[PDB]
Design a binder for this molecule. Sequence first.
Ligand SMILES: [Ca+2]
Ligand SMILES: [Ca+2]
Ligand SMILES: [Ca+2]
Ligand SMILES: [Ca+2]
Ligand SMILES: [Zn+2]
Length: 316
Amino acid sequence: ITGTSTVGVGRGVLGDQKNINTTYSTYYYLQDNTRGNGIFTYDAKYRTTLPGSLWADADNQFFASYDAPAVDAHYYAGVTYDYYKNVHNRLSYDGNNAAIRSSVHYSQGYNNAFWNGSQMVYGDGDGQTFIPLSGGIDVVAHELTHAVTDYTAGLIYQNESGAINEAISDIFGTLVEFYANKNPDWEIGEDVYTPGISGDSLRSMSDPAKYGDPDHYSKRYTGTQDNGGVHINSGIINKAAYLISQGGTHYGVSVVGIGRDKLGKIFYRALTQYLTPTSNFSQLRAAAVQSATDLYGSTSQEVASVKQAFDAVGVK
Ligand SMILES: [Ca+2]
Ligand SMILES: [Ca+2]
Ligand SMILES: [Ca+2]
Ligand SMILES: [Ca+2]
Ligand SMILES: [Zn+2]
């Protein structure tokens, strides 16, 4: 809507207070005009019809429990936009400042979040397995990254290309978490997963096997569930990414870490310049090697570490 840009204050899912960009026109709306063509947050009102109603508030104060998921979805979408713009020089997910839209309070007790090809959607969780999903910055960044992938590589959501699609979202979801410096780690969804159990998460990049996910190509899932194991086999790539950044010895292969910043630069280049809709793991390795070569030289330590990481997880 058309109005005056202002700043409101609220409390997120985890009870933390933060300022959010809103727009004033009779009501205060969750519409941030400071980033590209805007960031819009909608209320799905426990229904499944999207996007729902643009979030309207009477006093620009969002401290009600019902407001929490909206506050975080709105705020973290902004942080993610800032990451791509400041670190990778990318304006929004399409590279042309496309408006970012999110709907919260989707359905009832919905334990999931997703990008539906046009916008992000967040469930509130059942309160046991998950609390409102927008409370996790790595979750929000994971979802927005699916949009980036759709507009660039276009990796098909099935089998190996789908596992890569998933890993990319986990990787950048994690890099954004580090960017915001919000208790950063290499685990996925720890902030909103099982509120009754501390120390766990949905997936782990440092040690995928911790939750039964493969950490080597020889242990890849070949079944048909989960679209050919897109959330399962992503563990193989997540481990490779973790090794490239942090280093370590995996299955007898030693990898010298090159840091998070270079990891992000290498994968972003691979994603936007070399990957295609049907790229498989082996092609991802070639793309990553070529990207590191473009950026640091064929005889650089960076290129060496990328090769070692993929050798470590058995991807030739
Ligand atoms: Ca209010
Ligand atoms: Ca964390
Ligand atoms: Ca995390
Ligand atoms: Ca937990
Ligand atoms: Zn995903």
